[PDB]
Design a protein around this ligand. Sequence first.
Ligand SMILES: CC(C)CCC[C@@H](C)[C@H]1CC[C@H]2[C@@H]3CC=C4C[C@@H](O)CC[C@]4(C)[C@H]3CC[C@]12C
Ligand SMILES: CSc1ccc2c(c1)[C@@H](N1CCN(C)CC1)Cc1ccccc1S2
Ligand SMILES: CCCCCCCC/C=C/CCCCCCCC(=O)O
Length: 378
Amino acid sequence: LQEKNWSALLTAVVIILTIAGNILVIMAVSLEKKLQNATNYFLMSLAIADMLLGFLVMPVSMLTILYGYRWPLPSKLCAVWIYLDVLFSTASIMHLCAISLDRYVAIQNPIHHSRFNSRTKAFLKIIAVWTISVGISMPIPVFGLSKVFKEGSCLLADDNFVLIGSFVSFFIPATIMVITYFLTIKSLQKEAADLEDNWETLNDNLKVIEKADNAAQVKDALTKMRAAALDAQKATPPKSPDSPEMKDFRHGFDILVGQIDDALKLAKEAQAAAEQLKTTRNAYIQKYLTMQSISNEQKACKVLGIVFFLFVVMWCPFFITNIMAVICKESCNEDVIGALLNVFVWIGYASSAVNPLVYTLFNKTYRSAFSRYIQCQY
Ligand SMILES: CC(C)CCC[C@@H](C)[C@H]1CC[C@H]2[C@@H]3CC=C4C[C@@H](O)CC[C@]4(C)[C@H]3CC[C@]12C
Ligand SMILES: CSc1ccc2c(c1)[C@@H](N1CCN(C)CC1)Cc1ccccc1S2
Ligand SMILES: CCCCCCCC/C=C/CCCCCCCC(=O)O
């Protein structure tokens, strides 16, 4: 028991890293313009929930710890610490889960030429996240004042409250989160195979068109280039600020190939010289922007997979032991599994710390903001 005084300190480390880790994330997304992605707009709100969870309900989880788990505050405010903790936590899965199916639908749909709002779509999307988040949390204060106390410690004790609340707030979202996620990674991976194929196709026939000695050999070789070029025009990862240029440079590049074709049938010696995408800056940019754009979404999917994965890995101990309380009400000792719950809620409460760490470990631009922000300099 000499080493059990460390829990206070170790848990305070989990309280510190979450309040600081997500304070920067709120800062760094707002200040540095290079991180204004729609998916970085979600991350800025999520990180607020983790800031609000660290700032409100993780500490009194420790305050209770010090007292021996006998609830140390007024009787009357227990449903509000359960409510708050339920609400912010339930907003962190909703933020994660929204992100995954927001990115999922966009990859399996086209541009769709909507852009009704000017990247307030994030702002609309996030307020829907919280009202669904606070949709679910009204039942705790609705039956706020019993079903919230057990032997002088404060836990959700209504069996259906803690049974329904697992599927509605944890397993449905975690499953939804993961099911969409994997479909997308398989989808993105299977769309990079199309752009690379379309540029390889385009370059090989370009060499063929130049090196072909027959008169109409160009025809098959430069009609195919038109074919791939359109497919590329139809392909971009989810990511009108740079969408004209892609379309214009698609159109602008197509002109060069199109024109050579137009005068290819007419003819001959000159059209080989006419299809010279090798000599023009336009074509070189487009291969660049796509391969840089393809690779960026690779790393976003991986960084997101890390936060997705270790969110549900970390809270599953607390939810499996808790759902097992009600399923195993009679068979198994409740003083052991109640002990596991004192612990497995800090495996879970520690995810609020983790995701700022994984941002620095894999996003160069998130790293530089934090490092400066520690030094105070914008
Ligand atoms: C109770 C004691 C130990 C402090 C608890 C941790 C928090 C509240 C402390 C510790 C380190 C502090 C931060 C140090 C660095 C920055 C970045 C700066 O650009 C804005 C202020 C800010 C964000 C400070 C605000 C408060 C802070 C986050
Ligand atoms: C009791 S059954 C249940 C159902 C829903 C939710 C919780 C618990 C919540 N706990 C946290 C501990 N706190 C002492 C009580 C409330 C935990 C959590 C974790 C992750 C996302 C959402 C939620 S909301
Ligand atoms: C996705 C990763 C999943 C990891 C699962 C870890 C499981 C943690 C605990 C499981 C429930 C244990 C409950 C122990 C109660 C013992 C019952 C008794 O005393 O009779």
